[PDB]
């Protein structure tokens, strides 16, 4: 039954025919009869592991979305965990087109938590395939730009609590900021008000020179960011360095070095182009 439904969905996705619409309706009726989240998740997995790599579909995609909605109607935390694990295991072609097609707020929160955990695992393992999977998950989260500021705030608060894995989480957040075009910029600038600077300094005390290079790269990337309110970020950077408003002298020295590096990076962005190309937008 499930194999025939998967074959019909793959045939409908490859050849745009209506011969699998009645089969999809029968499968959708049978799924509400069983009322199993795990079975619907497994049915959506067979229709996206290899049935979504050939060609895009409409009726098969609708059937997969209905199965995913039926699975996500209940809680299904363990079902969501196995759905996220099989999707990251089979990240071939349109894996993100099926993973992020749920468009549910609780589903978006669970997918963001799974993507954050996958990025943490990728940063800890330092694997190229794991890093590519984390980048794909970040790109999938970027297209579903509904509400990720609370997730980013929770990730940043969790990162500042630790000191050992804080450097890896910070590097993973800096990389997604280079990937996702710095969606939560002003909220991040508002967050490091009074105590987060000391916690970040304590975390960076356990880092290495690779942490210093990553911080320089993150400063250069955040230089070409914050299009909404960059005056607040500039004033926060200026007062934390020369005005000695920071709680640590080493933090003030690091902020001064970051300001100097930002000026140096801004100089190459504005000056070094050569001849008449299209200009670089900052």
């Amino acid at each position: 039954m499930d194999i025939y439904v998967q074959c019909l969905s793959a045939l409908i996705g490859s050849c745009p025919d209506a011969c699998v619409d009645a089969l999809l309706d029968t499968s959708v009726q049978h799924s509400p009869h069983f009322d199993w989240v795990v079975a619907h998740i497994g049915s959506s997995f067979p229709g996206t592991i290899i049935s979504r790599v050939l060609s895009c579909g409409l009726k098969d995609f609708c059937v997969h979305g209905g199965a995913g909605g039926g699975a996500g109607s209940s809680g299904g935390s363990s079902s969501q965990t196995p759905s996220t694990d099989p999707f990251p295991g089979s990240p071939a072609i349109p894996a993100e087109k099926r993973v992020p097609k749920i468009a549910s707020v609780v589903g978006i929160l669970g997918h963001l938590a799974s993507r954050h955990g996958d990025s943490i695992r990728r940063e800890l393992l330092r694997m190229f395939h794991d890093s590519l999977a984390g980048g794909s998950g970040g790109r999938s989260g970027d297209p579903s730009l509904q509400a990720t500021v609370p997730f980013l705030l929770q990730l940043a608060v969790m990162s500042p609590a630790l000191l050992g894995t804080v450097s890896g989480e910070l590097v993973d957040c800096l990389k997604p900021p280079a990937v996702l075009s710095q969606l939560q910029q002003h909220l991040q600038g508002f967050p490091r008000e009074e105590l987060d600077n000391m916690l970040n300094l304590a975390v960076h005390l356990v880092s290495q020179a690779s942490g210093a290079g990553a911080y320089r790269l993150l400063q250069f990337l955040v230089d070409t960011a914050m299009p909404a309110s960059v005056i607040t970020t500039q004033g926060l950077a200026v007062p934390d360095t020369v005005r000695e408003a920071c709680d640590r002298l080493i933090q003030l020295l690091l902020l001064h070095l970051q300001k100097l590096v930002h000026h140096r990076g801004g100089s190459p962005g504005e000056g070094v182009l050569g001849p008449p190309p299209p200009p670089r937008l900052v």
């Binding site: 590096v261 100089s267 000056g271 182009l273």
Partner: protein, 83 residues
């Protein structure tokens, strides 16, 4: 800040000095030190406001040595801008 102790930072310092300098002998010092420390980087595509006429840009990119290309290009561009 004195003693930068960094390659990219020193690149930036010598670039900002190169953009600001008008004295040709000082510019020669910046160019020779900048080509000495770097390996194979062409340093004429370093300030987009420098402009050379099209036929003169065609003939001026024909010198073989990198130091002479960069020097004569940026000095003649600076001379045209000063005029």
């Amino acid at each position: 800040y004195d003693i930068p102790a960094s390659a990219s930072v020193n690149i930036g310092q010598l670039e900002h000095q190169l953009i600001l300098s008008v004295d040709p002998w000082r510019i020669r010092q910046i160019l020779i030190e900048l080509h000495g420390m770097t390996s194979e980087r062409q340093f004429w595509t370093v300030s987009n406001k420098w402009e050379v006429p099209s036929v003169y840009s065609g003939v001026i990119l024909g010198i073989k040595d990198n130091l002479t290309r960069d020097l004569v290009y940026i000095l003649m561009a600076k001379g045209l801008h000063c005029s």
